[PDB]
Design a protein around this nucleic acid. Structure first.
Ligand SMILES: N[C@@H](Cc1c[nH]c2ccccc12)C(=O)O
Ligand SMILES: N[C@@H](Cc1c[nH]c2ccccc12)C(=O)O
Ligand SMILES: [Mg+2]
Ligand SMILES: [Mg+2]
Ligand SMILES: [Mg+2]
Ligand SMILES: [Mg+2]
Ligand SMILES: [Mg+2]
Ligand SMILES: [Mg+2]
Ligand SMILES: [Mg+2]
Ligand SMILES: [Mg+2]
Ligand SMILES: [Mg+2]
Ligand SMILES: [Mg+2]
Ligand SMILES: [Mg+2]
Lengths: 117, 103, 20, 142, 56, 110
RNA sequence: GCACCGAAGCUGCGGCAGCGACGCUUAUGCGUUGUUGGGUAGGGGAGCGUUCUGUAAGCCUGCGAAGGUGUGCUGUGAGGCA
RNA sequence: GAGGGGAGUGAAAAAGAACCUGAAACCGUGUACGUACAAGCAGUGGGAGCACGCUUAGGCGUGUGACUGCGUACCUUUUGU
């Protein structure tokens, strides 16, 4: 039983080129080149799903920090406060409030300062 | 008027009427859920949580359908070592609307 | 076409001995 | 919901004046660089200039520590033949003093495209007054 | 001396940024006969600056 | 009316034909004829014959009125190429492609 | 000496799979629950799809088959359906 | 002349003889967006603006991708690329 092949083949190939849409030159034209481009994109992603959680945390911590300093206290002391502020737990992102509600923040800073007194 | 609450092993800042995506809850599609673990509420002045959680705090919301996220492609590849596996994954969610915020 | 005769030599030729 | 992002179309900025005089170069730079990058706000946006315009006076009177004043190197290359020119700190202050601070913070602002852009917000005047009245620059210490 | 990599389709185009042609604009009309012609050149009919030189 | 004309399997490369085409894209037909007329390239004569054939088409087959008539769309796609052989020496064969082009002129008025 | 930053380590929330036990209940599958799941040579297990025979004088199909090109959905994937 | 545009035949001419289907490399025309102070496997995580659809807004889909974190292709062969 001889097997035509080749209808399933371009299925495999187009399956890849489609994933390469947008890439420069051969990376989006030429399978042999695309199949690589497609893989490494995947590789970075899998990596950068883990990086994303790193990048944002330090994004948050960066701006948590200025606002803390803005209310006259370093990030160091300020998290230690909230920690010691009779237990109490609260995301570093959720300190979102540092950008959108600055009184609420300052308010959080005081509560923290008090525990440190 | 906003408040924040823990639910996904993860917190969220919410105003009422605001829809929000959460890790899956085991609550039927139309029912109503209360979140007692609320970490802060805010008006003109605000109650942060002495210990975690504010005493009178409870955020009320009805679930508004369950679903599965956009497929993500797990790619694993080890060059020059004759190894690779590619794996797809979707991840469940349940969407709640928020109607509570009992300050 | 008619167009079809290739008698490609041998390398080409000149030089090389590349220190022994 | 995605956390916030500064947007170039709507950043604040504001101007300032700083007096180099006795202040020690670099300990100064630090704050310039920090304020230049916006790292004291919703900086919260690596990919956006969120810093303030800030101008520096009396760069010539900037202070140094150690024997730095006669021993700090400052090298650069002309890209030519064998053109490794150098100039000591004092030598620098002597001819275009504003340079000393300029390069000193340029080195502390980030890397590439954006970085270069941040540096444009710093006006470094050798002397005492400055022709920027129009920006109504507000003084600040440190 | 030969390339080590295929120059791209892009690079090719670039090189040709200057290969493009210019029109004329300086096409001008004879004062006697109608006649468009290149400036300082005889017309199709043999007029140039009004006068008829060349019978051909 | 779009009304188009064209020259298939013209002997020229396309790269060459383009350059002459590019001078004409978008002009009032009237100007193009003059432009082509004083453009010293074989591809000019080619493109002209096509443009002319196009006008006469537009004229005799559709509306006409050449005066309000512009070359709105013109392109040249590369045609099939005639393979030949010549030899540079030592028997060592050289393909040489006598390349051809498909000139196309669309002359409308809107 | 007390902070804090910091990893795909630990924990938290959701999910899959193998092996356990305990409870619901056994031509089993649930619910917990403890635990395990980097990997070349290589061993073991389970699968997708292609061509062709039967099933098939059935079934789909000019009210549009195969192939080609898009789009939506779906599966852990090879894929599938529309 | 070559070649072409009409007309006409035909279910079909986009079946016109270089003729069923007509993929891919490769080459153009058109439009959207980016691009002339910027340095590297060209993607990936973030991400404004613009064009477009949405939705009644609601930081939504599609296309592009300033700026930005990270980031030296594949196979083979190797102690190791
Ligand atoms: N130059 C030849 C090497 C060579 C030297 N002597 C020759 C004699 C015959 C053919 C080739 C050679 C090459 O390119 O390989
Ligand atoms: N080996 C010498 C001479 C040489 C030229 N072609 C050769 C071929 C074979 C042997 C020697 C030679 C050189 O390259 O300068
Ligand atoms: Mg982590
Ligand atoms: Mg001979
Ligand atoms: Mg693995
Ligand atoms: Mg078949
Ligand atoms: Mg055909
Ligand atoms: Mg620029
Ligand atoms: Mg470069
Ligand atoms: Mg560099
Ligand atoms: Mg070796
Ligand atoms: Mg080995
Ligand atoms: Mg290596």
């Amino acid at each position: 039983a001889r097997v035509k092949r080749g209808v399933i083949a371009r299925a495999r190939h187009k399956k890849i080129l489609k994933q390469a849409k947008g890439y420069y030159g051969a990376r989006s034209r030429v399978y042999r080149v695309a199949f690589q481009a497609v893989i490494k994109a995947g590789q970075y992603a899998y990596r950068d799903r883990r990086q994303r959680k790193r990048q944002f945390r330090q994004l948050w911590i960066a701006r948590i920090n200025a606002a803390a300093r803005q209310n006259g206290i370093s990030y160091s002391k300020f998290i230690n406060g909230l920690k010691k502020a009779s237990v109490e737990i609260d995301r570093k992102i959720l300190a979102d409030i540092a950008v959108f509600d600055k009184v609420a923040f300052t308010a959080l800073v005081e509560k923290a300062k008090a525990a440190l007194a | 008027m906003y408040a924040v609450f823990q639910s996904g092993g993860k917190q969220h800042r919410v105003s009422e009427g605001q829809t929000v995506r959460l890790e899956k809850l085991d609550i039927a599609t139309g029912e109503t859920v209360e979140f007692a673990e609320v970490l802060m509420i805010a008006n003109g002045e605000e109650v942060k949580i002495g210990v975690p959680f504010v005493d009178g705090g409870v955020i009320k919301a009805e679930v508004v359908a369950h679903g599965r996220g956009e497929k993500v492609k797990i790619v694993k590849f080890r060059r020059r070592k004759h190894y690779r596996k590619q794996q797809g994954h979707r991840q469940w969610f349940t969407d709640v609307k928020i109607t509570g915020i009992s300050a | 076409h008619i167009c079809v005769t290739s008698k490609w030599f041998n390398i080409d030729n000149k030089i090389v001995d590349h220190r022994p | 919901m995605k956390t916030f992002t500064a947007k170039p179309e709507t950043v604040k900025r504001d101007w300032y004046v700083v007096d180099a005089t006795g202040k020690t170069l670099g300990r100064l730079a630090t704050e310039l660089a920090r304020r230049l990058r916006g790292k004291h706000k919703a900086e919260y946006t690596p990919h956006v200039d969120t810093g303030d315009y800030i101008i520096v006076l009396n760069a010539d009177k900037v202070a140094v520590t150690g024997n730095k004043r006669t021993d700090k190197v400052y090298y650069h290359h002309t890209g030519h033949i064998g053109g490794i020119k150098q100039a000591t700190f004092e030598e620098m202050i002597a001819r275009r003093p504003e340079r000393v601070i300029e390069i000193a913070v340029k080195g502390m602002l980030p890397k590439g495209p954006l970085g270069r852009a941040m540096f444009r917000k710093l006006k470094v005047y050798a002397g005492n007054e400055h022709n920027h009245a129009a920006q109504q620059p507000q003084v600040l210490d440190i | 001396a030969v390339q080590q990599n295929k120059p791209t389709r892009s690079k090719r185009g670039m090189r040709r940024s200057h290969d493009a042609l210019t029109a004329v604009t300086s096409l001008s009309v004879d004062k006697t006969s109608g006649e468009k012609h290149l400036r300082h050149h005889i017309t199709a009919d043999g007029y140039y600056r009004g006068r008829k030189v060349i019978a051909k | 009316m779009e009304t188009i004309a064209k020259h298939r399997h013209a002997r020229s490369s396309a790269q060459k034909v383009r350059l002459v085409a590019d001078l004409i894209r978008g002009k009032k037909v009237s100007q193009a004829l003059d432009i082509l007329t004083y453009t010293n390239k074989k591809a000019a004569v080619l493109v002209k014959k096509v443009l002319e054939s196009a006008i006469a088409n537009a004229e005799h087959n559709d509306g006409a009125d050449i005066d309000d008539l512009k070359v709105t769309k013109i392109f040249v796609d590369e045609g099939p190429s005639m393979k030949r052989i010549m030899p540079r020496a030592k028997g060592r064969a050289d393909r040489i492609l006598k390349r051809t082009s498909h000139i196309t002129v669309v002359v409308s008025d809107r």
